[PDB]
C-alpha cells in the first residue's frame with residue numbers, strides 16, 4: 001500500500017511552455033485554448049501589486065510565446081478568467097483527452113504533474129488540506145503545473161499551481177482561476193489558517209493497515225460519534241460526519257471492524273501516542289488517502 | 300520532500316495484455332517485440348511445478364493473444380529468455396520511446412506503473428531492498444507491470460513484476476528475465492533474506508537535511524570506510540561500495556561535507572540515538588531516497 005498517483009500520459013500530452021517578456025511558466029493546452037496563470041504577464045516590478053485587467057489590456061497576442069515541444073503555436077486571442085489566462089491558439093491539440101474542470105473539496109486527493117518549461121518532470125499524489133493549501137513538491141518555474149483525477153479516460157482538472165507559502169506548503173486555483181483558500185496572486189508572504197487533520201482519511205488509512213495485516217492499534221472499546229468528535233476537535237482533527245461514516249462502510253464490511261470501533265482505536269492513538277511504533281511504515285497518522293483511494297488500491 | 304514518480308506516459312504507450320487460454324497478464328511492447336512473464340503459458344495447475352521448456356514446446360505462435368486495447372497484434376515469433384517470454388509481433392509500436400534494459404542495484408529507486416489487462420492503473424516510486432524485494436502495491440493480474448527510470452527522454456526499463464511473497468513484499472526480474480534475488484517463478488511460498496537499511500540512501504537523506512539547514516547532527520570526527528562498514532553491519536545497515544561513495548559525490552560537493560565525515564556523523568547517530576530530536580521533521584532515518592532523488596528535488 002503506497003501513495004498511488006494516476007498515470008500522467010493523458011496530461012503530459014497537454015503541457016506547453018508560455019513566455020511573456022522575462023517570465024516563463026507552464027500552460028495546459030486543451031483543444032485550441034492554452035490555460036496558464038495570469039501573472040506570466042507581470043514583470044518582477046508588477047508582481048508586488050498588479051492591476052491585472054490594466055496590465056492585460058496593454059498586451060498583444062504577439063507578446064505571448066507558446067511552445068509545444070519545439071513547435072511554437074500562434075496566439076490568435078487572449079482573455080482572462082480570474083487568475084487564469086486563456087490564450088487562443090490557431091491549432092487544436094490532437095492529444096486533448098475527454099476532460100472536465102472541477103473544484104475539489106478539502107480532504108479530497110488528486111495527482112500532481114510537476115512540469116518545468118512545459119516538460120513533465122514528475123507525478124505524485126496530494127490532498128486538498130482543510131486550510132486549502134497542499135503539501136507539494138514544486139520548485140521555481142512550476143507554475144502552470146496542474147492537479148487532476150481520472151475516471152474512465154475522462155480527466156478532471158482540479159488544480160493549477162501558483163505559489164509556495166513561506167512555510168513550504170503550496171496554494172493555487174481551480175481551472176476556473178479561483179484560488180483555493182484566502183490567497184492572492186501577489187508577490188507577498190502569505191499565511192494560511194490553522195491546518196487540521198482530515199479525520200475520515202486517517203480512518204480510511206487505519207483500515208488499509210488492517211487489510212494489510214497491521215492490527216496493533218486496534219482495541220476493545222467503542223465510542224459514540226459525538227464523543228469521538230469531542231476528542232477529535234481537541235487534537236485539531238476535523239469532525240466526522242454521518243456521511244463520512246457511510247463512506248467508510250465498505251472498508252468496515254471488508255474488515256468486519258465497525259466505524260465507531262475504528263474511532264475508538266484512533267481516539268486512543270491520539271490520547272496515548274504511537275509509543276514509537278509505526279503503522280504501514282509511517283511514524284505519523286497519515287491523512288492523504290481517501291476511502292476511495294484505499295478501496296481502489298486494495299481491490 | 301516526498302516520493303515522486305517519473306511521468307508515466309512514455310511507458311503507458313507500451314502496455315499490452317498477453318493471454319494464453321485464460322491466463323492474462325501484462326506485456327511490454329517495444330518495436331515489434333512484446334515482453335511478458337513466461338508463466339502466461341501456464342494453466343494454474345502447471346504453475347505449481349512448471350517445466351517451462353516442456354510447456355513451451357507445445358505452444359505455437361497462434362496460441363498467443365496479444366491485445367493493444369481491444370486490438371489484436373498477430374504473434375509471428377516467440378522465444379523464452381530466462382523468465383520472460385519474447386513475442387515477435389507484426390507491427391512496430393509507433394509509441395516506442397528511446398529505451399534501454401538495465402539491471403539495477405539494491406537501494407536504487409524506480410517508478411512502477413501498475414497495470415491490469417494492459418490498462419495503466421497507477422504509478423508510484425519503489426526502492427529495490429537489499430534483500431531484492433520491493434514494497435510495491437500489486438493486485439491479481441498485475442504480473443508484467445514494469446518499473447523504469449527516465450533520463451533525458453530515455454526510458455531505462457529495470458523491473459518486471461512476477462510475484463508477491465507471503466510477507467506481502469514483491470519480487471520480479473530485469474527485462475532479460477533474470478530474477479532479482481533468489482526467487483523462482485513457481486507457485487510456491489518463498490522467503491526473502493533479512494532486510495537491511497540502505498546506507499547510501501540514508502546518507503543522501505542527511506545531505507538533504509544539511510542542504511535545508513538541518514545540520515545539528517554534523518560532528519567533529521571522521522572515519523575510514525572499512526571501519527564504518529564494520530560498525531554499520533552491527534546495526535543492520537548495508538556496507539558501502541565505492542560506487543556508493545561516488546554517487547554521493549555531487550551532494551558531498553554541494554554541501555562541502557566529505558562523504559567519510561558524513562559517515563562518522565551517521566555512525567554517531569547509530570550508536571547514540573537521535574535523543575528525541577528530528578531530522579527534516581522526522582524521528583526515523585529515511586532510506587528510500589537515492590542521491591539522484593535528492594538532487595532531482597533540489
Ligand SMILES: *[C@@](O)(CO)[C@H](C[C@@H]1CCNC1=O)NC(=O)[C@H](CC(C)C)NC(=O)c1cc2c(OC)cccc2[nH]1
Pocket residue numbers: 024025039047138139140141142143162163164165166170184185186187188189190
Ligand atoms: C511560479 O513559478 C510562478 O511563476 C512560482 C512558483 C514558486 C516558486 C518557488 N516554488 C514555487 O512553488 N510562483 C511564485 O513565485 C508566486 C507568484 C505569485 C502568485 C504572483 N509567489 C510565491 O510563491 C511567493 C511570494 C512570496 C513572498 O512574497 C514577498 C513571500 C514569501 C513567500 C512567497 N511565495
Ligand SMILES: *[C@@](O)(CO)[C@H](C[C@@H]1CCNC1=O)NC(=O)[C@H](CC(C)C)NC(=O)c1cc2c(OC)cccc2[nH]1
Pocket residue numbers: 323324338346437438439440441442443461462463464465469483484485486487488489
Ligand atoms: C501475477 O499477476 C501473476 O501472473 C501475480 C501477481 C501477484 C498476485 C498478488 N499480488 C501479486 O503481486 N503473480 C502470481 O500469482 C505468482 C505466479 C507465479 C510466478 C507462477 N505467484 C505468486 O506471487 C505466489 C505464489 C505463492 C504461494 O504459492 C503456494 C504461496 C505464497 C505466496 C505466493 N505468491
